Design an enzyme around this catalytic site. Structure first.
Site, PDB file in Angstrom:
ATOM      1  N   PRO A 147       1.974   3.408   9.937  1.00 12.76           N
ATOM      2  CA  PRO A 147       2.823   4.447  10.544  1.00 12.76           C
ATOM      3  C   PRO A 147       2.169   5.190  11.698  1.00 12.76           C
ATOM      4  CG  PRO A 147       2.165   5.019   8.291  1.00 12.76           C
ATOM      5  CD  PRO A 147       1.864   3.576   8.478  1.00 12.76           C
ATOM      6  N   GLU A 186       2.757  -1.312   4.380  1.00 18.54           N
ATOM      7  CA  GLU A 186       2.518  -2.244   5.471  1.00 18.54           C
ATOM      8  C   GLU A 186       1.380  -3.216   5.198  1.00 18.54           C
ATOM      9  OE1 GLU A 186       0.637   0.524   5.881  1.00 18.54           O
ATOM     10  OE2 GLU A 186      -1.238  -0.358   6.598  1.00 18.54           O
ATOM     11  N   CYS A 189       1.638   3.111   2.466  1.00 21.63           N
ATOM     12  CA  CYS A 189       2.524   3.102   3.618  1.00 21.63           C
ATOM     13  C   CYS A 189       3.352   1.828   3.712  1.00 21.63           C
ATOM     14  CB  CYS A 189       1.720   3.299   4.906  1.00 21.63           C
ATOM     15  SG  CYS A 189       0.581   4.703   4.867  1.00 21.63           S
ATOM     16  N   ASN A 249       0.832  -1.189   0.000  1.00 25.45           N
ATOM     17  CA  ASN A 249       0.000   0.000   0.000  1.00 25.45           C
ATOM     18  C   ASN A 249       0.875   1.251   0.000  1.00 25.45           C
ATOM     19  OD1 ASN A 249       0.764  -0.539   2.767  1.00 25.45           O
ATOM     20  ND2 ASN A 249      -0.770   0.977   3.378  1.00 25.45           N
TER      21      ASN A 249
END
Ligand code: ATP
Ligand code: ATP
Ligand code: TTP
Ligand code: MG
Ligand code: MG
Ligand code: MN
Ligand code: MN
Ligand code: MN
Ligand code: MN
Lengths: 289, 683, 289, 683
Positions: free
Chosen positions: D575, D379, D377, D375
């Site tokens: 995050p 993750e 981020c 994705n």
């Protein structure tokens, strides 16, 4: 009697290299021998160096010392053309035709080439020797500038013109012709300013200034011969280019109000073949017919 | 340098103070003796050629299977019996470089001119050998020329669509904007030029779901469309061409226009997206009276009235919009906006100008919709209905997106053969066939409007060529008289063919009953005004051809009333860029830009004199820039009075004239009834 | 990171005085009162005089001391615009609106004016104090230059923009808007060159340069308030002009990478309507642990 | 300057050589006694507040209608009974500036922290008063924090979507590319970050139906997506953020990377679209052996094998690709490509690095699909099936596009309350509710994947805060032991809750039977290895809580085999950028960037000390840049062994270190089993 007409001519000649699409030269470039491409790159690199210093140093410094807002406006415009238009156009040509490593190498080559360093040393030295309110030091720098505009560029200009005249590299050649058209008027203009200073002198002083001009020309000439041989021997053209630079040396002398120094010779005919809208408001009567 | 290129460049070499025009003919011979015949693939018989082309996926099997091989051979023999010869080198060069079928390796020529013409005729006839021979005689006489898509792609398996002018309506939603981007990409993939109407899109600073100052305006949509058109570039062959049209009363109109300024930033300027501005009569009235105008926020108007700003008549709606407090608007100076338009056209030739009321006061299908925008060439003017593309797994409301069928009459060849009627009717039949055989599976509104409206565009070209070869100045009143008569006959026979097709098939175009054809209003000026030539020279030009009178127009009106009309739109005059070379004709109805044009192909120079140019007609071949633009406007209006759609009308300006002169030409075009203005080419 | 981008934006904004026809301004000029005509003349002369200093000294002196060929080219282009374009444009506006004798008198008055002189000489003083190879003195001059380009011009620009926003003196207002658009980019560019020097300094030296910038701003601002009342009280506009000065002072500070000094204020709507880590090859055994 | 601003700035004014941390507390008091209490809107009772928020279109009335007003009053009283106080000024400031509900004009505060928590809990419970009170106690104790979309938008009428991240698979077709652009704009309109896998798109110079060198490659699609994300920018509030992921064996991988070079031209540079690179173990093996690698043309591979290049295992098919003459490939230096990756990450922090084999060697749903990209981020690591978006009027084959709901455990608050099990189960229930009430009507693959996979993401925050406040160095082996035990407990209770939900609903996620959960393989390392703390200090930290042993894991494995699992994916460590401020927690499981961070808001500057920072734990709050990245990699791998999805692992680098150090860190991460690397932030 002349600045206004030079102002108008300079501003009406305004151009940018991006106006000329260069991808059309890709094939005629690909087809040249390695020797020809090497000489061509180096020739334009030598020109780039000259325009870099003419734009950064020569034209601005002369502008600083010449009196009159209109004269300064012309000289400032010419300075802009040197480094913002001319010097940059060569990079447009390089970026089209050559890979980055060849471009990097040719700029390294200008730094270490002894003839190119010598001519820059001599010309820029005279620019930086100008003393405020000292018309003689200014004259000497203007002679140097005319020699750069009307003589020194021509060992470089020969080769793009030589190709243009054969129907080769014609887009790059179009850029070069625009640059040459500018330098011709720059050399005339600076020549007229130099003559102004020369004409103020005693006959004795004039005799010394002619000596300076001729000694400088000969010194630059001898260096240019070696530079020319170094670049053109590998393409077989050194003797032809030498005739061309002598031809243009005479034009530089004439721009300074002096007699030609070299005898006339036949130049390669190929090289000779190488040579917003106004707004009005709408009236109420324009809406009726 | 090849021999034919030397023979072509020998034209400029003057002998006895005259251009060696005849040398061009010799060049053609060389171009065929040295190059074309050497690189043309020859077969033992036509059967082997057709088998090789079909098997190697050059042609389509379906259209050839409708004929027996004897009929196809007869059509090819009819094409070759003319012994057609290209009169100029550039004609043959353009055909064999742009339209002639080449092998996959692009080194051999599979199709001659006669082969391509025969294939296009067989595709047109759809199984009728006699109709195919009629089409072959039409195209080998060069009386009619199918457009570049039709001429190039007809009968070819590896081809794009035969339609290349597409007009899309974009509704004010993210779903509709994304669908418009997708459809633009799909149509550019097919090889078509896509025009999008952005007037329904709400301006910058409007509300999205009742959050303020959220909309990016039409400029963000233009950036998206420009990226889509750059991406979809005919599989990396031609630069993706798109057009965006905005109403001048849209608030984004300045930012819209700011997309074409040179000083515009990279996040503002769109480079591959042409722009056109739609100018209603209200804007011209406001500029004329110097009253300050208002540019409106479309979404506020839609919320207040339930209809889009461009969907209602601004002449009667402008005062109500201004006096409505719930309609948000910004003050502008219409004269300043006109000067900005003129300045932008001087700099870049943009935007295209659409005079909305000039289009819609003669529009026959205002009941379906008023013409809100034009195409990429600013000559297609048709009714369009916006589509409501909803979310996924939800049924879309499919509207009407314009896609007309192009084809041009060669006025010189048509009139020298005294075959206006036959050429117009055969061209109408071919355009109907191509419209019926067009099926686009990724543009729902385009497909629906093609099925319903059945709109075609029959254009004309070689007007200036014909006039110059007949000793008539393009700006002369005799030229306008000829244009009036010729295009009135073209309109008459186009309407007659449309009504005949409607009678034969038993069907008209959708919503024909509400059109002015059905009510007979369209024929009013035709049943009261006689369009016979007023000059003896033009009448002698039309000798041997029956000129429809007022009684003939009354009979045609009665015939249309009884039987209807198959095509919603029939005539539109396209620029005709490269097909004019192959036909040895001047482009469109425009005057010639240059008497002899210099072009650079590869590293070689070539010279194309205008067709029929000689010492006797050198003066009559006046260049467009030297002409008075008011008289060009007069001629284009004279033609436009007989054309239901628009005419690609390029202005030809000198560098001396200012933006005031450009604005004066635009205002005289608006006054004279000009529907669209295409380009402002400065010499 | 920025010079080529500014090069592009600068050259694409190129324009010439001749493009705007000025004569149609006489149709609104004749309808202004004596105080309005007087203020306009005085403001115009103020802008002209300050811009001449920038063309003759400000831009060329910065171009001289800044290192980098591409920066020198952009700076040369900006100097050209001052001398060749802006100066001719101001002269054209004057010659259109006033007879020769009136122009000479206005320039005599503005040349003697205490508030115009104070700011003109403060700026020129900093340009004259630049020392070769001293980046601190160069920075101080750049601050002065940004203050002129992005702040000091605006007490003057106010009036033409005020008329332009009302439909008065539209031709000269269009010219002024083009000039102002050039000065805006000049201010931003010189600002980035100043920040480059600032960022090379220690924390103590930075604090010292900030104090210099704020102190200079304060001196110029207090004189601007007096300049403003002197010109604009007679036409009742001083309150709104003062808001415009502070708003533009904040822009000038932001150009120098500093925080705004003045609280945010709304502006007169008529004027608004007018407006590289070290690359080290993988040595193997870096894949094993 | 405000009084609370001065009090917060008083922290850095040292007294007796020590920071005045307690002043921060004073600031919060000021911030409440001078701004929040004055700017809050108070009603006579809760009934008037709820009515005003419902009729004024602030709250959705449906979720509040499931409770009687007495139950809502009891929930709000439970929220306010805790007397929650923000311990730092920045926590309250961030909540009341980013998450507290304000009026339409944003002049007053309508929602307190307790009000927001009560509304979110009532939305979560879906009509269960006791469950709503449990959620209230979980969030007011700050044991669990719903993601920014869920926390900000739950129960709001003007809300967006509660899902943070969306992952799209783009098939190699113009229809699929246009649909991907449309879906990206739709999801950015909804506020979510969109990630697109471009590995299936054929590279530059590929054939579009037998015409070669026609494709623009992934760079053209990248430009289209960049413009789409620029246009759809959350109504101009938050810049549209997109991610593009490309396999390192794609031929365009260099051009892909060249989109992020600071010297890239405008026609190539992409600035609003993050880039990620998916690196199989084959590429690392080739770089390690210094053998020249080959990047491949996806379309040739698809033509030869019938499957996409990223659809199959490169570790077993790379040699077949290389030896296949019908597959087109280009020679590259894998070590030079790694150095280019390191240089790009040093310059701009891009690309994201996804070690595909590290993801898929422990991926539980390889039967559905291998994880081919991550994705925005980096993750989310889930199985995705590409969709076949066909032409209009044709049915589309809808695949699976990844989408999961984020929620973070506050490690300090969870362990202080000794409630790992209860917090994990309640968070799993809340994420299941968020998934169930999510219905996206413009992303069909996202909707289908949400309905089938039922994937959720349960993250964790305040790992470094808990370790530093308990006297444990983040790089110490004791910290890794704590992370191992804590995240094994989290995984155990998440699996238990998923199986309990599957039992209570009688349904598992789609294709669960082929997963490693059904076969029992997933529990292998959990039924043979004991994850109890190896250090006495960590065991004391876990006192009062039943640490699952191998017997408990065997019982859970049997329970899963009997009942199945409701969620395909359960744990992903986001995050947690700005919501970590409100919870007074360090961001995610990453180490702190700085002990005290100076942030400029408006014209003022504020200093936020790390939660619990003081003199005694100053050196336990070691800054991330000062830490050994190898030990941070060890920590992230220790956590990752218990997380089924990935962890947003940001690398914290010093300016002195070279690209070789970055490459060494990347290779050690790959060696240690790190699935994804998020950012290379250089100090
Ligand atoms: N101007 C032209 N336009 C088109 N084709 C031409 C032209 N000139 C020559 N050709 C081609 O070259 C062939 C040779 O024509 P040429 O002028 O030599 O005499 P011909 O009597 O027409 O020859 P043929 O026996 O081929 O019919 C023509 O048949 C035709 O295919
Ligand atoms: N740090 C904080 N976090 C949250 N709310 C706070 C904070 N500080 C003050 N408030 C709010 O402002 C009010 C001010 O009251 P304060 O905390 O000074 O004590 P109080 O008047 O004795 O009452 P109480 O502490 O019992 O609420 C609090 O009741 C609370 O609503
Ligand atoms: C139409 C088009 C496609 N492409 C590329 C992007 C797509 O990933 C790829 C596939 O396009 P498709 O839409 O699949 O084209 P096609 O189906 O007609 O061709 P094929 O049968 O070979 O699949 O082509 C471009 O790069 N530019 C374009 O203009
Ligand atoms: Mg809508
Ligand atoms: Mg396909
Ligand atoms: Mn030069
Ligand atoms: Mn020069
Ligand atoms: Mn200036
Ligand atoms: Mn300036």
């Amino acid at each position: 009697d002349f600045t206004q007409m030079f102002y108008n001519q300079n501003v009406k000649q305004f151009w940018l290299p991006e106006e000329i699409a260069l991808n059309g030269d890709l094939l005629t470039w690909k087809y040249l021998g390695k020797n020809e491409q090497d000489t061509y790159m180096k020739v334009l690199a030598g020109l780039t160096l000259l325009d870099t210093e003419q734009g950064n140093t020569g034209m601005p410094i002369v502008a600083e010392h010449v009196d009159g807002h209109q004269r300064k406006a012309v000289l400032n415009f010419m300075a802009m053309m040197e480094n913002a238009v001319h010097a940059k156009s060569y990079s447009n040509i390089f970026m089209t035709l050559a890979p980055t490593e060849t471009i990097n190498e040719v700029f390294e080559w200008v730094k270490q080439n002894k003839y190119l360093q010598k001519k820059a040393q001599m010309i820029v030295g005279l620019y930086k020797a100008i003393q405020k309110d000292d018309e003689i030091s200014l004259f000497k720098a203007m002679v140097a500038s005319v020699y750069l505009e009307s003589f020194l560029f021509y060992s470089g200009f020969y080769y793009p013109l030589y190709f243009y005249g054969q129907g080769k590299l014609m887009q790059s050649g179009e850029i070069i012709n625009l640059i040459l058209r500018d330098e011709a008027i720059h050399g005339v203009y600076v020549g007229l300013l130099a003559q102004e200073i020369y004409n103020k002198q005693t006959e004795e002083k004039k005799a010394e200034l002619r000596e300076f001009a001729i000694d400088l020309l000969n010194q630059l000439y001898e260096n240019e011969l070696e530079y020319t041989e170094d670049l053109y021997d590998q393409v077989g053209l050194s003797h032809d280019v030498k005739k061309f630079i002598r031809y243009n040396a005479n034009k530089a002398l004439m721009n300074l109000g002096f007699d030609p120094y070299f005898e006339e010779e036949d130049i390669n005919p190929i090289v000779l073949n190488g040579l917003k809208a106004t707004v009005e408001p709408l009236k109420d009567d324009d809406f009726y017919f | 340098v090849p021999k034919w290129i030397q023979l072509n460049n020998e034209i400029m070499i003057q002998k006895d103070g005259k251009f060696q025009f005849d040398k061009d003919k010799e060049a053609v011979h060389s171009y065929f003796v040295d190059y074309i015949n050497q690189n043309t693939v020859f077969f033992h018989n036509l059967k082997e050629k057709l088998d090789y082309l079909v098997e190697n996926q050059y042609y389509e099997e379906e259209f050839l299977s409708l004929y027996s091989f004897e009929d196809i051979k007869e059509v090819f023999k009819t094409a070759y019996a003319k012994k057609f010869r290209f009169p100029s080198f550039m004609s043959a060069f353009k055909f064999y470089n742009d339209y002639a079928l080449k092998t996959n390796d692009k080194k051999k020529i599979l199709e001659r001119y006669e082969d391509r013409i025969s294939i296009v005729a067989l595709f047109f006839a759809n199984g009728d050998t006699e109709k195919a021979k009629e089409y072959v005689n039409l195209m080998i006489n060069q009386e009619y020329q199918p457009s570049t898509p039709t001429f190039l792609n007809a009968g070819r398996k590896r081809r794009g669509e035969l339609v290349s002018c597409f007009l899309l309506e974009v509704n004010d939603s993210l779903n509709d904007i994304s669908r418009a981007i997708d459809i633009s990409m799909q149509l550019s993939k097919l090889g078509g030029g896509v025009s999008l109407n952005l007037s329904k899109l709400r301006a910058k600073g409007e509300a999205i779901k009742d959050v303020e100052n959220a909309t990016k305006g039409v400029v963000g949509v233009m950036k998206l469309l420009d990226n889509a058109f750059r991406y979809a570039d005919q599989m990396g062959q031609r630069q993706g061409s798109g057009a965006a049209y905005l109403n001048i009363f849209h608030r984004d109109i300045n930012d819209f226009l700011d997309t074409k300024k040179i000083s515009a930033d990279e996040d503002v300027r769109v480079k591959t997206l042409s722009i056109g501005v739609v100018i209603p009569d209200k804007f011209v009235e406001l500029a004329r009276e110097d009253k300050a105008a208002y540019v409106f926020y479309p979404h506020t108007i839609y919320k207040e009235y339930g209809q889009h700003m461009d969907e209602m008549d601004m002449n009667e709606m402008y005062d109500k919009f201004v006096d409505n407090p719930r309609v948000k608007k910004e003050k502008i100076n219409p004269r300043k906006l006109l000067e900005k338009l003129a300045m932008l056209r001087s700099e870049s030739g943009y935007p295209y100008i659409m005079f909305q009321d000039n289009v819609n006061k003669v529009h026959a299908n205002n009941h379906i919709s008023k013409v809100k925008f034009s195409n990429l060439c600013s000559e297609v003017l048709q009714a369009s209905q916006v589509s409501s593309y909803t979310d996924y797994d939800e049924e879309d409301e499919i509207g009407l997106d314009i896609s007309c069928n192009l084809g041009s009459l060669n006025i010189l060849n048509v009139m020298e053969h005294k075959s206006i009627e036959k050429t117009v009717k055969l061209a109408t039949d071919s355009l109907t066939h191509v419209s019926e055989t067009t099926d686009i599976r990724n543009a729902p509104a385009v497909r629906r409007a093609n099925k319903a409206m059945k709109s075609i565009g029959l254009g004309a070209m070689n007007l200036h060529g014909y006039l110059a070869q007949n000793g008539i100045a393009y700006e002369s009143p005799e030229a306008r008289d000829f244009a009036n008569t010729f295009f009135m006959m073209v309109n008459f026979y186009s309407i007659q063919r449309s009504a005949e097709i409607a009678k034969e098939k038993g069907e008209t175009f959708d919503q024909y009953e509400g059109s002015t054809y059905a009510t007979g209003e369209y024929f009013d000026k035709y049943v009261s005004t006689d369009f016979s030539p007023k000059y003896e020279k033009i009448a002698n030009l039309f000798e041997g051809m029956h000129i429809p009178t007022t009684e003939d127009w009354k009979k045609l009106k009665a015939f249309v009333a009884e039987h209807g009309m198959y095509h919603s739109y029939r005539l539109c005059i396209a620029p005709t860029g490269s097909i004019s070379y192959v036909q040895s004709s001047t482009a469109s109805v425009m005057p010639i830009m240059e008497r002899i044009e210099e072009r650079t192909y590869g590293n070689s120079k070539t010279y194309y004199p205008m067709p029929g140019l000689a010492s006797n007609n050198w003066f009559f071949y006046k260049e467009a820039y030297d002409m008075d633009m008011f008289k060009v406007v007069d001629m284009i209006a004279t033609i436009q009075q007989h054309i239901d759609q628009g005419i690609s009308f390029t202005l030809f300006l000198k560098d001396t004239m200012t933006t005031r002169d450009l604005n004066r030409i635009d205002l005289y075009a608006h006054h004279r009834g000009i529907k669209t203005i295409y380009y402002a080419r400065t010499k």
